[PDB]
Amino acid sequence: TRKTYTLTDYLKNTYRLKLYSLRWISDHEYLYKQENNILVFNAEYGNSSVFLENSTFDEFGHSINDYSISPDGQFILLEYNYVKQWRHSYTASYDIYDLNKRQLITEERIPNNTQWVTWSPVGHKLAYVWNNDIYVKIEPNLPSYRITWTGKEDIIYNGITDWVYEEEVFSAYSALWWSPNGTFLAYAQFNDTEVPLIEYSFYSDESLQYPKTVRVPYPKAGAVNPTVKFFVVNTDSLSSVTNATSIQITAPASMLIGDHYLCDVTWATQERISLQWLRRIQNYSVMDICDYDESSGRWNCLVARQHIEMSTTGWVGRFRPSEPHFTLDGNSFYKIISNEEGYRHICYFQIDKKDCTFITKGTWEVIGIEALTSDYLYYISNEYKGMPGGRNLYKIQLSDYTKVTCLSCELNPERCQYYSVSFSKEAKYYQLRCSGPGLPLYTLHSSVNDKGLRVLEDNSALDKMLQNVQMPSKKLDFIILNETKFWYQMILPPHFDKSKKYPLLLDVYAGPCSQKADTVFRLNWATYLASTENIIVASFDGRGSGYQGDKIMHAINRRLGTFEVEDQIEAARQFSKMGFVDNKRIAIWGWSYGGYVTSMVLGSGSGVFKCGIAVAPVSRWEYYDSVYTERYMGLPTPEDNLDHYRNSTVMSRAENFKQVEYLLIHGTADDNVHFQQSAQISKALVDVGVDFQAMWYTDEDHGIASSTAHQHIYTHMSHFIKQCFSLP
Amino acid sequence: TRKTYTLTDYLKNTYRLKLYSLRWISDHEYLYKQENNILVFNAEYGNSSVFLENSTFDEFGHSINDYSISPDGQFILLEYNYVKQWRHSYTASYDIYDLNKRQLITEERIPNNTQWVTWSPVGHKLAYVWNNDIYVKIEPNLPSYRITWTGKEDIIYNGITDWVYEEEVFSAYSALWWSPNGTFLAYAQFNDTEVPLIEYSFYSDESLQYPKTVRVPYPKAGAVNPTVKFFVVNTDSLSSVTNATSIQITAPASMLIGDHYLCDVTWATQERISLQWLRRIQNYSVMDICDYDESSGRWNCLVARQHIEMSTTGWVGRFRPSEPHFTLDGNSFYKIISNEEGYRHICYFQIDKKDCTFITKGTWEVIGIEALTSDYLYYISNEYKGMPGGRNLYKIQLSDYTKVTCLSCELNPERCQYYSVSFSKEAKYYQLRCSGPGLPLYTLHSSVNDKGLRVLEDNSALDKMLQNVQMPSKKLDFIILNETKFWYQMILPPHFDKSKKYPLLLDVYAGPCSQKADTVFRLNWATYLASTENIIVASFDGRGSGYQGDKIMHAINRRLGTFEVEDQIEAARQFSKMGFVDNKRIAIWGWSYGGYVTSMVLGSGSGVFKCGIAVAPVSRWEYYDSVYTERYMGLPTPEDNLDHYRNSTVMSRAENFKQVEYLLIHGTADDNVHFQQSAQISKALVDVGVDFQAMWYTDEDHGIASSTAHQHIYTHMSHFIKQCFSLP
Numbered sequence A, B: 001t002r003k004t005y006t007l008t009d010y011l012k013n014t015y016r017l018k019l020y021s022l023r024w025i026s027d028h029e030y031l032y033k034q035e036n037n038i039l040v041f042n043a044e045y046g047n048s049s050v051f052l053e054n055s056t057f058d059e060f061g062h063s064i065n066d067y068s069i070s071p072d073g074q075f076i077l078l079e080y081n082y083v084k085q086w087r088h089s090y091t092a093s094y095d096i097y098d099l100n101k102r103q104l105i106t107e108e109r110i111p112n113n114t115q116w117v118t119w120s121p122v123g124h125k126l127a128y129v130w131n132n133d134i135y136v137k138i139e140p141n142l143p144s145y146r147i148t149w150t151g152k153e154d155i156i157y158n159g160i161t162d163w164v165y166e167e168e169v170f171s172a173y174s175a176l177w178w179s180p181n182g183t184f185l186a187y188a189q190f191n192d193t194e195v196p197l198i199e200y201s202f203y204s205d206e207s208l209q210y211p212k213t214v215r216v217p218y219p220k221a222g223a224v225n226p227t228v229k230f231f232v233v234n235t236d237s238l239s240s241v242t243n244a245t246s247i248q249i250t251a252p253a254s255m256l257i258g259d260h261y262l263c264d265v266t267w268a269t270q271e272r273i274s275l276q277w278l279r280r281i282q283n284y285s286v287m288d289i290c291d292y293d294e295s296s297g298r299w300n301c302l303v304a305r306q307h308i309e310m311s312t313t314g315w316v317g318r319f320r321p322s323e324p325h326f327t328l329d330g331n332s333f334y335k336i337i338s339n340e341e342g343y344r345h346i347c348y349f350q351i352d353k354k355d356c357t358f359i360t361k362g363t364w365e366v367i368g369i370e371a372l373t374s375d376y377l378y379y380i381s382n383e384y385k386g387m388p389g390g391r392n393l394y395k396i397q398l399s400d401y402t403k404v405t406c407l408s409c410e411l412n413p414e415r416c417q418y419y420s421v422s423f424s425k426e427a428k429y430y431q432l433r434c435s436g437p438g439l440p441l442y443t444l445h446s447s448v449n450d451k452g453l454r455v456l457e458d459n460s461a462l463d464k465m466l467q468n469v470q471m472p473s474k475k476l477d478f479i480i481l482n483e484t485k486f487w488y489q490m491i492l493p494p495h496f497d498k499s500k501k502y503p504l505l506l507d508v509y510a511g512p513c514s515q516k517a518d519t520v521f522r523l524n525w526a527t528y529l530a531s532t533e534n535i536i537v538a539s540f541d542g543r544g545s546g547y548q549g550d551k552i553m554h555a556i557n558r559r560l561g562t563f564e565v566e567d568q569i570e571a572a573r574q575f576s577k578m579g580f581v582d583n584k585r586i587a588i589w590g591w592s593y594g595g596y597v598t599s600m601v602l603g604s605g606s607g608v609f610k611c612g613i614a615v616a617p618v619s620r621w622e623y624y625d626s627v628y629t630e631r632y633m634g635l636p637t638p639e640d641n642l643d644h645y646r647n648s649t650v651m652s653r654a655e656n657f658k659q660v661e662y663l664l665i666h667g668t669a670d671d672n673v674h675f676q677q678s679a680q681i682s683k684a685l686v687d688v689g690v691d692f693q694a695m696w697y698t699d700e701d702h703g704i705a706s707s708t709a710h711q712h713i714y715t716h717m718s719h720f721i722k723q724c725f726s727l728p
């Protein structure tokens, strides 16, 4: 009898998914890490050579965390002493190695504790942030030029984001953007002077006698937000003037009237940059297109080139206004926007004309624009077979929009339905990455004829291994509610027999624009639960979910904690009505937003669920950050949406928890969803005399991803689920 | 057929013990609150009168928390707006009512947020502390005189103790001491300038958007300690024109050579005060006796009147040097000190003589000196029947030490074996308070011939109720370990049948000088466990325990976490050998020091315990405060006792928890044993992959005593124990 996929298999990663991460260094070459060393591959023929021997830095005296080659291939940036901060931010040390002279630069070294470093897009200039100030080095071994002097820990951030901009606006720590050929360096400056601080203890190693209090500028809903300014400096003038002038580009009058955000920075040409601003009430956005004025050394944004993007049904963009993709001459651009039917499609804009032209349309959506050449635009969409959970690459002819070719749909339709892509520098080649429903498959293709060049990694080794394992199956389908299709997926135990009643676990997230039902292949906790414990693990995408139009996504506008919670309950009823579910054993669990929904569902009094697990849940929206929360909830004030803010808390439903078994878990060093959120849930439960299970994870953050904690939480959760389902 | 004592009975206080808390106001009368009416009783005849009507303040507009009548009966201090701080400290608002003119004083009233207030010992002067400074009021309606001007939150404390002195030295917030007739007001001043602060989050009500960070000067083991100064001010010569002049009494040179503490202040006469100082290495203490000089107006402390107290086997005193009891003329005093055999007995001192004479002796100990007259000294001891867990009142003839009379031993030997006492002003009368083994019994007595005047409260009402309940019994006995007898107690289920096998829960504290095996009658969680769940609850006093001499108490000197932990395992091992114990179901639980021992036991690898619960445990001594920790452990420096500090942590034993079920609980706002201690235990268990149960209590402190949290913790622990023992 074949073994099953056990908890230990998951926690010990015995069945490893292989991938193929390459880094394009030009239009026909990419770097690949093999046998600890770095190889350089010729895309056209597949032949390679050693770029950097694995023994090159054996006497470096430091474990290299990552590397980065300068655009011109003359230098390599070595990163070590890596110290993680938030989701994207971290600090590290850096050394620059001269590839030609094959030596390690020892003079004018990048400072230790550098917050961010980046090569110019061409050549080998460097810009880095240290102590919250920007510095530029024209040459790796020469002194750097300081660009800002206002940097101040936790107060003024130049070239880097503060907590909320990192997490909710830029999805990145860096806040600097080199112009195309590297002459200009643009950057943002954030001022958190009046932003309140979240404070929590960090215990550290046992040796630390007094706990440390971590303090970070974090604006909760309705609180004082950081303010922002934008500047551009001409780096080519640095060696000619004592102190190069940072020219400020001010936000438009429509934004200055109130609180706002800088939400996108995109260079169009060597002397043209585009900026998008968003009002704190996120349903109004403005894009300025600014040109350099060689006679005044200033930047001017003509109102005739300003574009407005607003929404009457919700917020602007999936999570923020989309980025523009400019044609070479910078006189036009393509951008994903919601059409009149509420579906996100590609619109073609002339920079000085306010009306755009949609080049795609249909009851499906464009996920992202991947590359633009003089003749073709490549994008990913979920058009294929009307499956919102699938992803494919398409190519559209710019001289004839009726000519759209799907480049990935038919490559291997049974094994591959979810693709992402990586183009070379000038889009001459592209790597396709299939992630499901079958085992991931990585392939290389030539753009000139769209012919497949070869298979990079097919995961044959893993396929061989899984053959001797009783793996579960996955079903992706939909149910019709109110004349609208809503998709779900189910991880089914091996030898699934529809004539039997299986216990069911609803795996939920359900936040705005989320998608938990898709064609991706995963090896996770649900895999073990279905394979070894014979539990059906389901997920449902209801109102508020993404990639299916604004009608479904904006259904929860200003009303978080309502329809997305209710639809999760309704989904459980629908599943039980399918006949193979044991109504006495229906549980629910989720992490983060999923923790919130789980908690709201368990406290609804529905009677449908027996038990549930909430990990790092939100419990009241006023405790979460402003940028994310206000996007969907507006402001927590009596004149705006305070009433719904107060009505959608987990705490107000404490009394209903007497009807269920609950396990609440939270990391004490969660800088994102503060431990405070679960601290208030537990106190409310204690106040109404409700017994429940709890677990805090010392010094773990929102991901509770440290190796030991990860193994510990899933083990603890498994025992809880097995007990609730009366499983041996 | 009849009901048992249930968990609800314990949590809802269904069966309440009646008390009789009286307040002696003279040598013949006492105050007693009845029906919200303060009555005055005549001890000789038992007749009473109403002293203050419950309706006297029906329109006061504030809920009175407590009252305090001036010594002369002319005024009554009304306490309201009570806000608790630490174990003894709190702030409140006060109003003074004139009992003669039946009027509430409205002029020059005590400020709100007053930290401490106290009437002079005679008359009606008042002294209070506000904003860390001392004020004196000669008359209730007159302006107060400012005594100190250096008070500063968390830095300089005048007349009140800082955190560590409140908790570990004075067991009080007050640091003010009126002379016998109220002429002088002595006070201490604490300086915490360089004492590090413990910081932790306080979440508050749900409405608080950002958690608050509480910061308390708290010296952990080996850290910088607060410094102290002592002053005496003449309150009869205060000037409304000039600032009061405080006279300082400096500590002796043998103390000034390094860190030290002020540990006792006791007035001897109207013009003589005694102070005891303790070195930071708590095995050397010095008592100074100081006399006021009318000429120079200074206080002089003759070296000839100095008394040294040291210990070679441990620290000085049970928790600190004992207090002296001076004779009327103040020329000699009695004090409890450890004799040559290591037993605490009463020594008689001459103020100018170095050698003191022991007036009691034997293999038992004097617990405390209760009253002193020219002919007799009254004291409580555990001499009777050689039972260290019993307490009786004795009097010894001062002119012939061979004449010792037990005054409570034979009153009712079956019902009463544990007494405390309260004497009237000149010891003319005394109230005896019997607290076990039968129901509490309060009686009043006359000293001249030790007549038993009357029964004040006999709890006959509770006795009637308990008749219809299957109550557990209590067995108190001993076992021998190396020629030494160690006592234990067992709470046995109703209808105990020695032929049956019962599961057993070891209830432990085991800190230095602790006593968990005694003759006290208690209605607690253990009562329910024995009565309703049929669980035997045992407690054992091993090495390190008190009231049995230094050989036993000092056995753990510089070695916490060793013998007291090993002796609990040994006792359990022996209990398991008994025919009525199910060796497969033995558990252990403890709170505070008991949580530490419970954890150390469960991590010992003994295999004797199936499960255990630790509530607010200490986990490593370097995290606990200096005064208590160093008393037993010396300093955590390599030259002193660092190795043992590092060997006695719970964390180093994590691996051994793999074979036991463990439940770890802790309040997040514990200012005493910081949450940090449990946060490090959990992290260590996670680190070695051991599963366990946990529960944090939001905003609860060391007592986890708020009404809802109290019910919730005991409910949660009951489920855990029943589960561990497989009980319905």
Ligand SMILES: CS(=O)(=O)c1ccc(-c2noc([C@@H](CC3CC3)[C@H](N)C(F)=C3CCCC3)n2)c(Cl)c1
Binding pocket: A167, A168, A171, A509, A510, A511, A512, A513, A514, A515, A516, A592, A593, A618, A624, A628, A672, A673
């Ligand atoms: C359905 S799922 O694949 O598990 C999934 C998981 C996470 C998200 C997600 N949505 O916002 C965010 C984060 C934004 C990042 C920039 C993306 C967001 N800041 C966050 F962590 C939250 C936790 C509780 C409330 C919001 N993550 C989404 Cl939409 C979907």
Ligand SMILES: CS(=O)(=O)c1ccc(-c2noc([C@@H](CC3CC3)[C@H](N)C(F)=C3CCCC3)n2)c(Cl)c1
Binding pocket: B167, B168, B171, B509, B510, B511, B512, B513, B514, B515, B516, B592, B593, B618, B624, B628, B672, B673
């Ligand atoms: C045996 S028992 O009745 O449960 C019991 C309970 C408490 C104590 C006790 N010993 O020190 C203390 C406290 C001192 C106060 C002045 C009394 C002490 N500061 C404390 F809270 C500790 C908690 C962990 C380490 C010590 N309490 C003792 Cl000796 C015995």
Ligand SMILES: *[C@@H]1O[C@H](CO)[C@@H](O[C@@H]2O[C@H](CO)[C@@H](O)[C@H](O)[C@H]2NC(C)=O)[C@H](O)[C@H]1NC(C)=O
Binding pocket: A040, A041, A042, A045, A047, A048, A049
């Ligand atoms: C892949 O193989 C080709 C064929 O040998 C290599 O092509 C060389 O290309 C350079 C131009 O950069 C010519 O000067 C040479 O004539 C070619 N090689 C030889 C030996 O003549 C190519 O360098 C290889 N690429 C990698 C990454 O190994």
Ligand SMILES: *[C@@H]1O[C@H](CO)[C@@H](O[C@@H]2O[C@H](CO)[C@@H](O)[C@H](O)[C@H]2NC(C)=O)[C@H](O)[C@H]1NC(C)=O
Binding pocket: A150, A156, A191, A192, A193, A194
């Ligand atoms: C960051 O913003 C703060 C405003 O909150 C600025 O501080 C003010 O600066 C002005 C001008 O000097 C002073 O008059 C005010 O007293 C300051 N207010 C506060 C609250 O500090 C600060 O100058 C800004 N910093 C930068 C680099 O822009």
Ligand SMILES: *[C@@H]1O[C@H](CO)[C@@H](O[C@@H]2O[C@H](CO)[C@@H](O)[C@H](O)[C@H]2NC(C)=O)[C@H](O)[C@H]1NC(C)=O
Binding pocket: A148, A149, A150, A243
């Ligand atoms: C380089 O130029 C900048 C801009 O003028 C200088 O920054 C200003 O410094 C003055 C005084 O130090 C402040 O009052 C201004 O608030 C600063 N403005 C900005 C935008 O930062 C900077 O000091 C100059 N550096 C040197 C070395 O001269």
Ligand SMILES: *[C@@H]1O[C@H](CO)[C@@H](O[C@@H]2O[C@H](CO)[C@@H](O)[C@H](O)[C@H]2NC(C)=O)[C@H](O)[C@H]1NC(C)=O
Binding pocket: A181, A182, A183, A234, A236, A270, A271, A294
């Ligand atoms: C990168 O682009 C910049 C901006 O267009 C170029 O700099 C300009 O060069 C022209 C000459 O072609 C001059 O007339 C302008 O004065 C320059 N402008 C500025 C702001 O410097 C630059 O030459 C380009 N770099 C490269 C390597 O081609």
Ligand SMILES: *[C@@H]1O[C@H](CO)[C@@H](O[C@@H]2O[C@H](CO)[C@@H](O)[C@H](O)[C@H]2NC(C)=O)[C@H](O)[C@H]1NC(C)=O
Binding pocket: B181, B182, B183, B236, B270, B271, B292, B294
């Ligand atoms: C409390 O005791 C003090 C000190 O013995 C008394 O004050 C002394 O009283 C005598 C006689 O009246 C004076 O000659 C001394 O000069 C006083 N000494 C001081 C330091 O004041 C005081 O009278 C007593 N108070 C009461 C109420 O008995």
Ligand SMILES: *[C@@H]1O[C@H](CO)[C@@H](O[C@@H]2O[C@H](CO)[C@@H](O)[C@H](O)[C@H]2NC(C)=O)[C@H](O)[C@H]1NC(C)=O
Binding pocket: B281, B283, B284, B310, B311, B312, B313, B634, B639, B640, B641
């Ligand atoms: C009080 O206790 C201290 C500490 O145990 C004793 O001081 C010394 O302690 C060190 C260890 O820290 C030993 O090596 C010494 O032998 C101890 N004595 C001396 C003189 O250094 C001290 O002896 C104790 N005092 C009394 C009166 O017993």
Ligand SMILES: *[C@@H]1O[C@H](CO)[C@@H](O[C@H]2O[C@H](CO)[C@@H](O)[C@H](O)[C@H]2NC(C)=O)[C@H](O)[C@H]1NC(C)=O
Binding pocket: B029, B040, B041, B042, B045, B047, B048, B049
């Ligand atoms: C207790 O009863 C006695 C009488 O036996 C009361 O009497 C004493 O005090 C009265 C007022 O203070 C006087 O009027 C009596 O003369 C006096 N009697 C004696 C023998 O001295 C006494 O007040 C009562 N005490 C209380 C508190 O009620």
Ligand SMILES: *[C@@H]1O[C@H](CO)[C@@H](O[C@H]2O[C@H](CO)[C@@H](O)[C@H](O)[C@H]2NC(C)=O)[C@H](O)[C@H]1NC(C)=O
Binding pocket: B150, B156, B191, B192, B193, B194
């Ligand atoms: C409280 O104690 C501090 C020392 O901890 C006293 O200040 C002293 O220490 C300072 C460091 O914080 C030094 O800078 C000062 O020179 C020193 N003070 C003097 C007079 O030299 C402080 O004065 C104390 N406060 C009181 C009221 O005694």
Ligand SMILES: *[C@H]1O[C@H](CO)[C@@H](O[C@@H]2O[C@H](CO)[C@@H](O)[C@H](O)[C@H]2NC(C)=O)[C@H](O)[C@H]1NC(C)=O
Binding pocket: B109, B110, B111, B112
């Ligand atoms: C301490 O606080 C109380 C309550 O505020 C003060 O009493 C007055 O309270 C009324 C309303 O209850 C207010 O209008 C007054 O402002 C308060 N003060 C006065 C003088 O009336 C009380 O006075 C305060 N105590 C002290 C010493 O200031």
Ligand SMILES: *[C@@H]1O[C@H](CO)[C@@H](O)[C@H](O)[C@H]1NC(C)=O
Binding pocket: A035, A036, A037, A054, A055
């Ligand atoms: C590169 O180094 C690895 C280990 O550091 C070694 O196994 C391998 O042999 C080296 N590469 C080649 C091509 O030999």
Ligand SMILES: *[C@@H]1O[C@H](CO)[C@@H](O)[C@H](O)[C@H]1NC(C)=O
Binding pocket: A093, A109, A110, A111, A112
């Ligand atoms: C970085 O820090 C290391 C260790 O402190 C030191 O040896 C090195 O010189 C530093 N380098 C720079 C550029 O500061």
Ligand SMILES: *[C@@H]1O[C@H](CO)[C@@H](O)[C@H](O)[C@H]1NC(C)=O
Binding pocket: A281, A283, A284, A310, A311, A312, A313, A634
């Ligand atoms: C933006 O949102 C606010 C709040 O709902 C609303 O009052 C305003 O009319 C909206 N603007 C647009 C263009 O929809």
Ligand SMILES: *[C@@H]1O[C@H](CO)[C@@H](O)[C@H](O)[C@H]1NC(C)=O
Binding pocket: B035, B036, B037, B054, B055
């Ligand atoms: C005082 O009020 C209480 C109510 O708590 C009442 O029981 C008592 O009878 C009252 N006192 C008198 C003398 O009636």
Ligand SMILES: *[C@@H]1O[C@H](CO)[C@@H](O)[C@H](O)[C@H]1NC(C)=O
Binding pocket: B149, B241, B242, B243
């Ligand atoms: C008393 O001392 C304080 C503090 O130095 C001072 O402010 C005040 O004026 C003094 N009062 C008199 C009467 O000297």
